[PDB]
């Protein structure tokens, strides 16, 4: 017999209905199941009709694996899935949140907070375009991005993943979506999923909803706010995402007024599906359903029931798939979860797969491997890094000569600080490892290397990680560039109540600036206590977490381009003010949202 779902000339809805009408319960629940590569095997994927795989942070085939190695791994998993009775291709997901960041040699773009500082949605679209290509270079078809959290408290470990505390800036940056997925047609219906084809990836608006609104910025915690506030701060960018055809939405670990998002039928079904008319698929976060209960995973039967009834379509298990499949099967067999709910989840998952061309191109394209770390993408990352920089100070008094831009020609210059020659530090979390890492973890250019690449051949560059005051004063230096700040962190490990940079940092700045005129480059995922750093420095730049392309920093330091970045967040005077956002009754910032000094290119 002719098999309609296999016919590439047929409309998506027809293909979805045709395939769905053929599937067993096992095949349906399989589609709903996403498993980590570390638990996947050809037999597992085939026997359990698995619909999706992911790499968690740092979950890689080998350290230093080539683009081809990634393609081979993904294709190996795909072969097993294509060998099932129905041959439904799996979709492979990954956190490609600032480039294809788990991958060695991938271009690492500035984190979201810095991109907010650029106020350049077209730059962000271009970054999405480049990211899609580097993700496809590794055979992966699905990026868990963008995070459209509106971070309202910088004590949150994920504040750097938020473009801004101002939802209007977050809304504007949803341009990442058509970058990743491709532009939607003129005829497009808001809420439908869209991916243009094999050179693009499925995107993911996350984390629904109010992840950036938790008390004291506590990660995964309670967002306490009335519906009006939830709707005018935390929700709006989701509607922009619907208008741009975002393929998937990931649910937040957080709660809204005490109700776990992963169990919230009102918001997931009532609002996202039934009001916004979202027609792509809804995915849990990592063990998100487990964390509905306290303790997490103490009643997995309840977790499955609550999340699936709430309207989630695909569960990022990601390890204990046997338990997940067994429990869900039992719930359906016992009539506790109706077939209509299962059929809805599967319809959505298949819709996205058919729409994106996955049935036509289930395997990696070897000719895409060369897109990984490609120079054009690094040039874009370098542009982004430079545009993200916010100049906070450029002279100690109103009568001082501006320090920046610095001359490329000088007899001798000093580069200093824990962050001057540390690629891992300048990239921050979600880089190679989940939590990021220290040192030369990938291909890139540190601030020190960027300085050496920029300066006149006659200028002697001296590096000292933590020089004492005497070394600096006796060194015969024309000026110094000193880089300090936060260490890499991700999620809960980044939650921080004091927001004071680790030492040595301030001590190094004080020692260097005490001895010679200094430009301080602050590396951070967020505003941090900055008055002491300011007090010591002739100039100070908030560089955020600029990524692999440290020449973005020197492009502005040496005046190849003027500074243009403006704060996408309020800079607080002290942490005891927090939360404190532009518009509050008490608003007493050190630097207001939108603040930024400028220079002109020399
Ligand atoms: C303000 O709040 C901050 C958040 O709570 C807090 O930072 C945290 O401090 C705690 C200790 O109190 C750290 O936990 C421990 O981390 C140890 C290893 O830490 C190094 O490596 C990790 C990455 O693996 C980095 O994140 C750390 O910054 C640290 O980096 C090292 O720092 C040195 C000094 O700057 C450098 O010279 C060195 O090069 C550098 N190394 C690297 C690789 O970058 C572990 O060994 C411990 O076991 C402990 O880990 C915790 O154990 C319990 C478990 O439940 C936790 O989940 C686990 O994390 C924590 O890493 C750190 N968080 C950061 C920085 O993100 C501030 O404390 C200050 O800074 C820290 C780093 C210490 O110097 C403190 O003495 C200092 O007080 C808070 N600040 C103030 C003023 O109170
Ligand atoms: C010395 O530096 C100053 C400060 O940067 C330059 O003035 C700025 O020039 C920008 C244009 O390059 C102006 O931004 C634009 O503003 C208009 C209207 O608001 C907007 O339509 C543009 O899109 C653009 O806005 C940017 O868009 C991209 C975003 O990422 C970015 O955040 C936006 O700002 C900016 O307003 C202007 N600032 C001031 C205070 O005047 C100055 O550039 C020169 O003068 C300006 C006014 C403009 O005519 C430029 O063409 C011209 O080069 C620069 N001087 C020199 C010699 O270059
Ligand atoms: C928001 O964050 C707070 C602070 O972490 C959460 O409260 C904490 O909840 C945990 C369990 O989820 C508690 O740990 C347990 O404490 C009991 C003793 O009461 C002990 O028997 C267990 O072994 C375990 O250690 C913790 O006490 C509690 N902390 C405080 C100070 O309240 C809260 O649950 C989070 N809210 C949301 C909605 O996520």
Whether 491 is a known active-site residue: answer yes
Neighbours of 417 (CB within 10 A): 32
> Mutate which of 115, 124, 391, 600 to test ligand 2's pocket (most atoms within 8 Å of Cβ)?
600
Longest dimension (CA), the chain: 87
Q: Which of 203, 128, 117 lies closest to 166, judged by CA?
A: 117
**What is d(CA 126, CA 193) in angstroms, rounded to the nearest whole number?**
20
Per annotation, catalytic residue among 95, 287, 421, 491: 491
Among protein residues, the one with the nearest Cα to ligand 2's atom 13 is 564
Whether 285 is a known active-site residue: answer yes
Neighbours of 498 (CB within 10 A): 9
3-class secondary structure, 518: strand
Question: Residue 36 in contact with residue 54, Cβ under 8 Å?
Answer: yes
Cα-to-centroid distance, 118 and ligand 2 (Å):
13
Q: What is the DSSP letter of 579?
A: S
**What is d(CA 207, CA 214) in angstroms, rounded to the nearest whole number?**
12
Contact residues for 329 (Cβ-Cβ < 8 A; gap 6+): 25, 26, 29
Lookup: tokens for 457: 């051949």
Q: What residues pair up with 597 in beta bridges, in sequence order? A: 391
| Domains of the chain in sequence order | 1-373 (3.20.20.300), 374-559 (3.40.50.1700)
Question: Residue 355 in contact with residue 194, Cβ under 8 Å?
Answer: yes
**One-character DSSP codes across 430-478:** SBSBTT--SS--SS-B-HHHHHHHHS-TTPEEEEESS--HHHHHTTT-S
Q: What residues pair up with 142 in beta bridges, in sequence order? A: 93, 202
224 lines ligand 3 (CB under 6 A): no
Q: What is the DSSP letter of 119?
A: T
Residue with tokens 């927090």: 578
Specify the length of the chain in residues: 602
340 lines ligand 3 (CB under 6 A): no
Question: Residue 57 in contact with residue 490, Cβ under 8 Å?
Answer: yes
State the number of CA atoms in the 13 A half-sphere of 318 facing the CB: 21
Give me the torsion for CA of 127, 128, 131, 135, rounded to 10°: 180
Lookup: tokens for 253: 């670990």
Cα-to-centroid distance, 498 and ligand 1 (Å):
13
Burial bucket for residue 508 (CB in 10 Å: 0-12, 13-18, 19+):
buried
Sheet-wide strand order for 142-143: 142-143, 91-94, 52-55, 33-36, 315-316
The experimental technique used to determine this model is: X-ray
Q: Encode burial over 516-540: b for 16+ CB neighbours within 10 A, e otherwise.
A: bbbbbbbbbbbbbbbeebbebbbbb
Question: Residue 330 in contact with residue 300, Cβ under 8 Å?
Answer: no
Question: Residue 483 in contact with residue 523, Cβ under 8 Å?
Answer: yes
Q: Spell out which residues line ligand 1, taking CB within 6 angstroms.
A: 438, 487, 489, 493, 496, 498, 500, 502-503
Question: Residue 68 in contact with residue 74, Cβ under 8 Å?
Answer: no
Q: What residues pair up with 53 in beta bridges, in sequence order? A: 35, 92
The helix-helix angle for 12-20 and 339-355 (nearest 10°) equals 140
Contact residues for 128 (Cβ-Cβ < 8 A; gap 6+): 175, 176, 177, 178, 179, 180, 181, 203
Question: Residue 122 in contact with residue 175, Cβ under 8 Å?
Answer: yes
Peptide bond into 207 cis (omega under 30): yes
**What is d(CA 13, CA 10) in angstroms, rounded to the nearest whole number?**
8
Question: Residue 380 in contact with residue 218, Cβ under 8 Å?
Answer: no
Neighbours of 588 (CB within 10 A): 12
Cα-to-centroid distance, 290 and ligand 3 (Å):
16
**What is d(CA 48, CA 51) in angstroms, rounded to the nearest whole number?**
9
**What is d(CA 495, CA 522) in angstroms, rounded to the nearest whole number?**
19
255 lines ligand 3 (CB under 6 A): yes
Neighbours of 399 (CB within 10 A): 6
Per annotation, catalytic residue among 285, 383, 486, 495: 285
Among protein residues, the one with the nearest Cα to ligand 1's atom 73 is 502
**What is d(CA 48, CA 293) in angstroms, rounded to the nearest whole number?**
26
Q: Which of 131, 43, 37 lies closest to 79, judged by CA?
A: 43
Question: Residue 68 in contact with residue 369, Cβ under 8 Å?
Answer: yes
In this structure, what are the phi and psi dihedrals at residue 103, rounded to the nearest 5 degrees?
A: -95, 130
Nearest 5°: the CA angle 20, 356, 112 is: 125
Q: Spell out which residues line ligand 2, taking CB within 6 angstroms.
A: 118-120, 562, 564, 598, 600
Q: What residues pair up with 461 in beta bridges, in sequence order? A: 413
Q: Encode burial over 330-346: b for 16+ CB neighbours within 10 A, e otherwise.
A: ebbeeeebeeebbebbb
């Amino acid at each position: 017999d002719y098999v309609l779902y296999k016919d590439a000339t047929k409309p998506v809805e027809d293909r979805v209905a045709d395939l769905l009408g053929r599937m067993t319960l096992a095949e349906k629940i399989g589609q709903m199941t996403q498993i980590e590569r570390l638990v996947a095997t050809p037999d597992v994927l085939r026997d359990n009709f698995i619909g999706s795989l992911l790499s968690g942070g740092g979950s890689v085939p080998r350290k230093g694996a080539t683009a081809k190695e990634w393609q081979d791994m993904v294709d190996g998993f795909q072969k097993a899935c294509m060998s099932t009775r129905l041959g439904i291709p799996m979709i492979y997901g990954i956190d490609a949140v600032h480039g294809q960041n788990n991958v060695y040699g991938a271009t690492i773009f500035p984190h979201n907070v810095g991109l907010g500082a650029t106020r350049d949605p077209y730059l962000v679209k271009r970054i999405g375009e480049a990211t899609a290509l580097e993700v496809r270079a590794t055979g992966i078809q699905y990026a868990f991005a963008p995070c459209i959290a509106v971070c309202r408290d910088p004590r949150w470990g994920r504040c750097y993943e938020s473009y801004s505390e101002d939802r209007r800036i977050v809304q504007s940056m949803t341009e990442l979506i058509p970058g990743l997925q491709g532009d939607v047609p003129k005829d497009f219906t808001s809420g439908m999923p869209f991916v243009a084809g094999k050179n693009k990836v499925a995107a993911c608006a996350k984390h629904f909803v109010g992840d950036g609104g938790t008390v004291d910025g506590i990660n995964e915690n309670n967002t306490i706010i009335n519906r009006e506030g939830l709707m005018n701060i935390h929700m709006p960018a989701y509607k922009n995402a619907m208008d741009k055809g975002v393929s998937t939405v990931m649910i937040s670990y957080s709660s809204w007024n005490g109700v776990k998002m992963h169990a919230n039928q009102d918001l997931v079904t009532g609002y996202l599906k039934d009001t916004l008319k979202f027609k792509g698929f809804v995915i849990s976060d990592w063990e998100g359903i487990d964390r509905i209960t306290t303790p997490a995973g103490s009643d997995y039967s309840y977790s499955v029931k609550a999340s699936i009834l709430a309207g989630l379509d695909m569960i990022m298990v990601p390890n204990k798939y046997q338990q997940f499949i067994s429990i869900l099967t039992g719930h359906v067999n016992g009539g506790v979860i109706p077939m209509s709910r299962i059929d809805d989840a599967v319809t959505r998952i298949l819709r996205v797969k058919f729409t994106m061309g996955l049935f036509e191109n289930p395997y990696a394209d070897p000719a895409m491997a060369e897109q990984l770390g490609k120079q054009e993408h690094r040039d874009l990352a370098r542009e982004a890094a430079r545009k993200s920089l916010v100049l906070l100070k450029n002279g100690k008094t109103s009568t001082d000569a501006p320090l920046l831009p610095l001359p490329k020609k000088a007899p001798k210059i000093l580069v200093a600080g824990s962050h001057a020659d540390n690629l891992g530090y300048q990239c921050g979390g979600w880089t190679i490892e989940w939590q990021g890492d220290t040192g030369r973890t990938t291909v890139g250019t540190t601030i020190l290397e960027a300085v050496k690449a920029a300066v006149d051949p006659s200028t002697v560059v001296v590096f000292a990680e933590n020089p004492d005051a005497e070394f600096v004063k006796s060194g015969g230096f024309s000026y110094a560039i000193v880089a300090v700040g936060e260490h890499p962190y991700t999620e809960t490990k980044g939650d921080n109540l004091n927001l004071t940079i680790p030492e040595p940092g301030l001590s190094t700045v004080q020692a260097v600036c005490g001895g010679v005129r200094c430009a301080t480059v602050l590396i951070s995922g967020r505003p941090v206590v900055v008055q002491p750093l300011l007090a010591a420095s002739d100039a100070l730049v908030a560089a955020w977490l600029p990524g692999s392309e440290g020449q973005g920093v020197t492009d502005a330091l040496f005046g190849d381009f003027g500074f243009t970045g403006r704060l996408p967040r309020t800079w607080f005077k002290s942490v005891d003010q927090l939360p404190m956002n532009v518009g509050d009754a008490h608003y007493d910032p050190l630097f207001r949202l939108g603040y930024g000094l400028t220079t002109n290119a020399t």
